[PDB]
Amino acid sequence: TKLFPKFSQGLAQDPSTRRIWYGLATAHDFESHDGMTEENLYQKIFASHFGQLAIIFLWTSGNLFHVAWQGNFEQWVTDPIHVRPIAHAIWDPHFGQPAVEAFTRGGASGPVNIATSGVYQWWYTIGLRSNQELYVSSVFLALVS
Amino acid sequence: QVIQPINGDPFVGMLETPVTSAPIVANYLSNLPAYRTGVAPNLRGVEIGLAHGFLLAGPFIKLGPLRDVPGTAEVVGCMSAAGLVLILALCLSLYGNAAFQNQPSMGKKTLSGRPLPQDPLMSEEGWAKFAAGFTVGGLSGVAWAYILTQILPYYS
Amino acid sequence: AGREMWYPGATPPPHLDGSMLGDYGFDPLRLGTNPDRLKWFREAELMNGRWAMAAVVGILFTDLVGLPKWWEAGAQTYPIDNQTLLIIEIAVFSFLESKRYEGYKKTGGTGFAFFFPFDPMGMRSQDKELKELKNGRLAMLAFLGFASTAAVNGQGPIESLQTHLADPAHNNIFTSSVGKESCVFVAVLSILPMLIEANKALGKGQESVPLFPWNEEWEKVA
Amino acid sequence: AHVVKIYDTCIGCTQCVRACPLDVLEMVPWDGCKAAQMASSPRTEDCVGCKRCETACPTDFLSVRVYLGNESTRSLGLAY
Amino acid sequence: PWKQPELDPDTPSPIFGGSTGGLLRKAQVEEFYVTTWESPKEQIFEMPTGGAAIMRKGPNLLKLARKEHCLALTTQLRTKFRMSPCFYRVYADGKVEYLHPKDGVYPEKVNAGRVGVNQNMRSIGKNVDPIKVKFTGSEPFEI
Amino acid sequence: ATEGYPFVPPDWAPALFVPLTGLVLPAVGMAWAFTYIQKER
Amino acid sequence: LQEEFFQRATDAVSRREALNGFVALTGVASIALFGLKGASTLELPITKGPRMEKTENGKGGILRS
Amino acid sequence: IRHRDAIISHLNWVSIFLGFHSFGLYIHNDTMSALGRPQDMFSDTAIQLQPVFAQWIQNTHFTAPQLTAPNALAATSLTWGGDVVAVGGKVAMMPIALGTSDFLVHHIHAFTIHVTVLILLKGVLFARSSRLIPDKANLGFRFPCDGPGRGGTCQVSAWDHVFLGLFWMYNSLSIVIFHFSWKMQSDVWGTVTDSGVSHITGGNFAQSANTINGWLRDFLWAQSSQVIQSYGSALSAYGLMFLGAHFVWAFSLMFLFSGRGYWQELIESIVWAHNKLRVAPSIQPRALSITQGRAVGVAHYLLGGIATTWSFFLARIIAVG
Amino acid sequence: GWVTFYWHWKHLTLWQGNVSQFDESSTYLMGWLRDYLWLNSSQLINGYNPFGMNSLSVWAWTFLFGHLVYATGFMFLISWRGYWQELIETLVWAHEKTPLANLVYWKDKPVALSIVQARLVGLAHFSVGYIFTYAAFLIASTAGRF
Ligand code: CLA
Ligand code: CLA
Ligand code: CLA
Ligand SMILES: CC1=C(C/C=C(\C)CCC[C@H](C)CCC[C@H](C)CCCC(C)C)C(=O)c2ccccc2C1=O
Ligand code: SF4
Ligand code: SF4
Ligand code: SF4
């Protein structure tokens, strides 16, 4: 008898490798969990929705932080039609010398990745101009997360 | 009839073959540190780790990313081998915590009876001592393989 | 965990009953939850604190006598080459720390060389251990402050004290380049006892143990 | 292990117990059928869920039903 | 049957060579199964996990890893030589369990001595919906 | 700095943080999960 | 005599707690040394930079960046 | 039958070993090409795996008429020869040079054949009985399953082992004929000139068959440009055959991924529809059997793949060669 | 995939200026294939030639990566559990009856993936491979020229 499927006592009695896969797969199937009522199920879903909200806000805060750190948002503001957006810098130790040289796009120094997520146009449209404001947005979104 | 099962019983799987019934193979396997029941787990761990950490330095030095750099290929290969040795030591400790949280109830039942009460390797603290011997042997063998590339009459 | 606590109104950790001295209930992450682990961490704390005490009093002595800066002292000229100096340092420490570890195995005391405990004067008392622990932790924090003021200010402790006495309103940490970092950090540290109090208030009967990879307190959770 | 249930639609053809190579099913006397027999499953924990009894069942719908779930070392057909 | 028989370790075993299909470590840490039959002459039968073996004239003993192997051998023997065998279950601690002929007359017969178990007097498809048994821990077919 | 107070990370931070979450954090994840799965009651 | 040196080698790290702590400390120390000091001394081709390479992109015109 | 587990286990081990040290080399070369490090490749310019045994056999067979077969006028073939025969200005047969890429592809072939023979021999050996199902002999040769018991015994019959073996032989022979076509078009077939000999493709097999992306771009994309541009010409039927083969290959995956219960229920709905206005057939419509569905899927898959390769090969070799 | 093929090809022909090429080439499927999956894939597969490497080397690697994951999805989708159980049983016998490795023993018994699990993992591998290869091709064909 194991204890990894704490939600499913029958799954913990499984002595095979199927227990791991089924416990991972039936992780948020609260309606089939052992000894669980309706009210606790609803409260668990409420907490899970809060968790997904926190994850979403953390992810967009990270997008703001990485754009403000390693992007070319000021250069994109000065010239949107010419300068390409930059998502995040590339630090891969398995990269070769030509590989570093082939990813310094957008007028950057190190290896960077060109952003095609559309956040540069969106943030230029809503009045965000400097990376200071993107940094403040990132820390505020981390705070609300 | 050379081909026969061990101890004259057919209900088992593994059967006695001239690959296994050769006296050279049997005495080589019995004298290996992993099958030396009368020795402490840390000593056989030291021998096993020494052998494996000595062999692991080879491919990292010879085929490493900096193999064309003279004087730094051996250092990088040996420290990567030591890191791999540490990874295997972590694996050994995790296996000792995992497989020995319970207690065995039966012996090994060696040939012609005369079984030892319990193998100290198959315990929790025994396997922890085995992992300690393994990592000590691993870094010592890696360090020996480094200095064997420092003094040399041939190649490396 | 002692009536005096790390913040006033705190609850002791379940393993921190206060049997060992120097207890103040300060175990947020609960690093040591095993008595063998707890006593090894106490011995390691005493070792690092004693070295911090020796290093700090050497720092004040060297700054008082006028010797040059400590972080630049490694590049200064010295008799005996650093190679054989390092070699004899490991040569003597492979015996000193060996005797220390063997004495800790057989007795548990912090003796020196063949003398366990190395107390020829004989002021062995629990209050002496408590005073040593407090002064040691203060020297730990003092060495961290010395390293910080060597890094960002580039001046010794005596020069830092003179700059604090000359203009304390502006020649502080909070007006430096690591200023607002320290402001946010100390604001988080001020908020920190209230979040712990809120966890205790809402969690009236729950364990609420901090489950972390460094401890097996999560085994009782599930 | 799995759950094996026999409903009253069974007519006692005693062929569901022949198709099961695990001795899960058994035939008990009954009075609700012409053959005066009914399938029963005393050794239900030995079942693997191979549904050979459902294949052998002639009634529509099936008198003997096997429900999967809660696998064990005997329900998974493991010799190791 | 009339009296429950206990297996005898003194019965011989059929002549067979080494087969890789057979007992494993599960026979040590967990239970294993032993099949016993009485033969009038030396015949050749196929093992459920190996090749072909010659049974002995008289009692026989076969150790198999699973109950399915034992019942496959039992069905093969009953179809071929009308042997009517029986198999046991030997646990890791030495406990011996009697499995196949609990009444001694096989599951095909009734013997008027066994009770009904896991039988529903309702028709299949008359079970309640899962909404009616939600958050109860009981399946509709378990009622 | 001119309002670098929403703290700008150093230009050498990737060299420490990329292997930290590529090599150490996966190692802690495997070790913690493997201790979780092989836990008997 | 040979066994004693390795016995005292293991006795300080015999516990699985001690060896887990040792491998964790060495792993984080080595990873923190790598990149910060491990790179730029082996001349790893991630911390060097370009000479003057790959500023323009787009072979079908437009010539961004 | 007695030691079948040992045979299957050793065959599985050597299959996995061959797969790793035949395909991870390709993936590694793909990575170091994508990492901008061609000097770390498993290629001739970088560190190499020279097929010394094949080259030694070639040299022995070239020198075989000199000593071991003195009555032969020349070598038994021009694979290992030294002369380039040419008829009508086109190279009939010229010596074949074996390098690192040839070593990689030959060991990939060995891996693929070892896996296919593993599947077929496991199907043959475990057809009678197995540790999972001891009574597999009484279930016949071609049966779909023994039910979802023991975790699910689908495709446990020897027929389904052969059903997978058809796909694995398809993969093996497809890689074999791809190797043949690329090697001939890059190192044998071509037009002879007064200044040297020019092949169909400019020797791209030596420098492009070390990576999967190189294989793709320089064989399936560098060629097949005449199949797509065959419209309005004599080879347009080859393009039609190509796209119809794409259709039949893609249509097979319906019969392969799906099962029978969903299709039986859909057929039940269609039977209701035909019942509403009384066009119900007297023969009850039923879905294809599980073995029947597997057979249809593998047959349509093989037909689509074979006709795809047939159309591509023939259009490329007629529009160019 | 159909809606994104339509969007990408129509917009690519709009941006390049030859809307007539899409108008006269989207009628027949061979024109669709030749002028979308072949013409626009020229810059994608030239990410890392043996001659050299460019910025689209990551997109070609992602393209082949999605192909490989889709192929592993086929591996999980075509073959079904029941043959893998016997193969795993043979591997179990191999591990249990070998020197220097029977000392290390599993705590969780190796068991082949369940049929529902098989469908899930085949669908998962299929979908991530599909998404990655199409994203790589789309961004490489739209970034190679503009
Ligand atoms: C969750 C969104 C997210 C994602 C996917 C990334 C992705 C990346 N970051 Mg970034 N990062 C983020 C948020 C994110 N970041 C935030 C919010 C911060 C500010 C605290 C940073 C600060 C940061 C630094 C300083 C560096 C990176 C770096 C990197 C790269 C290497 C991966 C790495 O080391 O992780 C980043 C590792 C960290 C420890 C920093 C993140 C701290 C997290 C967000 C807080 C913990 C939250 C939660 C408990 C755990 C998150 C998991 C959740 C998503 C399930 C990669 C492009 C490195 C790089 O090379 O830059 C390209 C680098 O040096 N990141
Ligand atoms: C995303 C995280 C990540 C990171 C940061 C790295 C980082 C690295 N990998 Mg990669 N790798 C990764 C994921 C990652 N890997 C994955 C997921 C795979 C599988 C697909 C690989 C597969 C892979 C291969 C196949 C190889 C690498 C190699 C390398 C190294 C590049 C060459 C180099 O610097 O020489 C290494 C230089 C070093 C300084 C590192 C050695 C330091 C080690 C970690 C330990 C040294 C301390 C040692 C224990 C001594 C202490 C003793 C103690 C008593 C104090 C570098 C350390 C190469 C390598 O290992 O080179 C030898 C190599 O051949 N990697
Ligand atoms: C191209 C598609 C594809 C691929 C790659 C696989 C892969 C596999 N199948 Mg499968 N197969 C497929 C389609 C595919 N299948 C389809 C569609 C069917 C249906 C007919 C089958 C039918 C089938 C049968 C019937 C059998 C297999 C077997 C195998 C295995 C062969 C092991 C080997 O030698 O290769 C080596 C391994 C690989 C190629 C996997 C990729 C490894 C790459 C090179 C990366 C290397 C490791 C990497 C560095 C680690 C990354 C770490 C990271 C997580 C951090 C392997 C797991 C056989 C088996 O079980 O083993 C022999 C077997 O008997 N398959
Ligand atoms: C599609 C499908 C079906 C449904 C397919 C069926 C019932 C077979 C249909 C065969 C048709 C009727 C053959 C004739 C086709 C056309 C009518 C021919 C037209 C010819 C023109 C000249 C008009 C299954 O039954 C099935 C079973 C198991 C696994 C997968 C599947 C599966 O994928
Ligand atoms: S197969 Fe069905 S109908 Fe027939 S005897 Fe068994 S339960 Fe009754
Ligand atoms: S599913 Fe199979 S083992 Fe279970 S009762 Fe039915 S026929 Fe017997
Ligand atoms: S999914 Fe089909 S082949 Fe697999 S066990 Fe079920 S009925 Fe048999």
Coordinates of C-alpha atoms in Angstrom, one line a residue, chain E residues 3-134:
Chain E
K3 CA -13.0 -34.1 2.5
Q4 CA -10.6 -31.3 1.5
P5 CA -7.3 -32.9 0.4
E6 CA -3.9 -31.5 1.5
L7 CA -1.1 -31.5 -1.1
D8 CA 1.8 -33.8 -0.5
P9 CA 5.4 -32.7 -1.1
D10 CA 6.4 -36.3 -1.6
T11 CA 4.6 -36.7 -5.0
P12 CA 7.0 -36.7 -8.0
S13 CA 7.2 -34.2 -10.8
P14 CA 6.9 -34.7 -14.6
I15 CA 10.1 -35.0 -16.6
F16 CA 10.9 -31.6 -18.1
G17 CA 13.9 -29.6 -19.2
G18 CA 14.9 -26.1 -18.4
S19 CA 12.3 -23.6 -19.7
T20 CA 12.7 -19.8 -19.4
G21 CA 8.9 -19.6 -19.1
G22 CA 8.2 -20.6 -15.5
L23 CA 8.5 -19.4 -11.9
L24 CA 9.8 -15.9 -11.2
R25 CA 10.7 -13.8 -8.1
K26 CA 6.9 -13.5 -7.5
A27 CA 7.0 -17.1 -6.4
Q28 CA 9.2 -16.0 -3.5
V29 CA 7.9 -12.6 -2.3
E30 CA 4.2 -13.4 -3.2
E31 CA 2.1 -16.5 -3.6
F32 CA 2.5 -19.2 -6.2
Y33 CA 0.3 -22.0 -7.4
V34 CA 0.7 -25.8 -7.4
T35 CA -1.3 -28.2 -9.5
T36 CA -1.8 -31.9 -8.7
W37 CA -3.2 -34.7 -10.8
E38 CA -3.1 -38.5 -10.8
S39 CA -2.2 -40.3 -14.1
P40 CA -2.6 -44.0 -15.1
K41 CA 0.4 -44.0 -17.5
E42 CA 3.2 -41.8 -18.8
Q43 CA 1.7 -39.4 -21.3
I44 CA 3.0 -36.2 -23.0
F45 CA 1.4 -32.9 -22.2
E46 CA 2.2 -29.3 -23.1
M47 CA 3.0 -27.0 -20.3
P48 CA 1.0 -23.7 -20.3
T49 CA 4.2 -21.7 -19.9
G50 CA 6.8 -24.0 -21.6
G51 CA 7.2 -26.8 -24.1
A52 CA 6.2 -30.5 -23.7
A53 CA 6.7 -32.7 -20.7
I54 CA 6.1 -36.3 -19.8
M55 CA 3.9 -36.9 -16.8
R56 CA 4.6 -39.7 -14.3
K57 CA 2.5 -42.8 -13.8
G58 CA 0.6 -41.8 -10.6
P59 CA 0.7 -38.5 -8.7
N60 CA 2.2 -35.4 -10.3
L61 CA 3.2 -32.0 -9.1
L62 CA 3.5 -28.8 -11.2
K63 CA 4.4 -25.4 -9.8
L64 CA 2.9 -22.5 -11.9
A65 CA 3.1 -18.7 -11.3
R66 CA -0.5 -17.8 -12.0
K67 CA -3.9 -19.3 -11.4
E68 CA -4.7 -18.8 -15.1
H69 CA -1.8 -21.2 -15.9
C70 CA -3.2 -23.8 -13.5
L71 CA -6.7 -23.6 -14.9
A72 CA -5.4 -23.7 -18.5
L73 CA -3.5 -26.8 -17.7
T74 CA -6.6 -28.2 -15.9
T75 CA -8.8 -27.6 -19.0
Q76 CA -6.1 -29.1 -21.3
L77 CA -5.9 -32.2 -19.1
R78 CA -9.7 -32.6 -18.9
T79 CA -10.2 -32.1 -22.6
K80 CA -7.3 -34.4 -23.6
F81 CA -7.1 -37.3 -21.1
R82 CA -10.1 -36.5 -18.9
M83 CA -7.7 -36.1 -16.0
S84 CA -9.9 -34.0 -13.6
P85 CA -7.1 -32.3 -11.8
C86 CA -6.9 -29.8 -8.9
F87 CA -4.6 -26.9 -8.1
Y88 CA -3.6 -25.2 -4.9
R89 CA -2.1 -21.8 -3.9
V90 CA 1.0 -21.6 -1.7
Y91 CA 1.6 -18.2 -0.2
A92 CA 5.0 -16.7 0.7
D93 CA 4.6 -17.6 4.4
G94 CA 3.7 -21.2 3.6
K95 CA -0.1 -21.0 3.7
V96 CA -1.8 -23.5 1.4
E97 CA -5.1 -22.5 -0.2
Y98 CA -7.6 -24.8 -2.0
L99 CA -9.0 -23.1 -5.0
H100 CA -10.5 -25.1 -7.9
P101 CA -12.7 -27.9 -6.5
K102 CA -14.2 -26.1 -3.4
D103 CA -17.3 -28.3 -3.6
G104 CA -15.3 -31.1 -5.4
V105 CA -17.8 -31.2 -8.3
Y106 CA -16.4 -28.3 -10.4
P107 CA -18.2 -25.0 -11.2
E108 CA -20.1 -26.7 -14.1
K109 CA -22.3 -28.5 -11.5
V110 CA -24.2 -27.0 -8.6
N111 CA -24.1 -29.7 -5.7
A112 CA -26.9 -27.8 -3.8
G113 CA -24.4 -26.7 -1.2
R114 CA -23.2 -23.2 -2.3
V115 CA -24.9 -19.9 -1.7
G116 CA -25.4 -17.1 -4.2
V117 CA -22.9 -14.3 -4.2
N118 CA -22.8 -11.1 -6.2
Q119 CA -26.2 -11.8 -7.7
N120 CA -28.7 -9.1 -8.5
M121 CA -32.4 -10.0 -8.6
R122 CA -33.1 -7.0 -10.8
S123 CA -32.7 -7.1 -14.5
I124 CA -29.6 -5.7 -16.3
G125 CA -30.4 -2.2 -17.4
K126 CA -32.8 -1.6 -14.5
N127 CA -29.8 -0.1 -12.5
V128 CA -30.1 3.4 -11.3
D129 CA -28.3 6.3 -13.0
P130 CA -24.9 7.4 -11.6
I131 CA -26.5 10.7 -10.5
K132 CA -28.7 8.8 -8.1
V133 CA -25.6 7.3 -6.4
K134 CA -23.3 10.3 -6.8

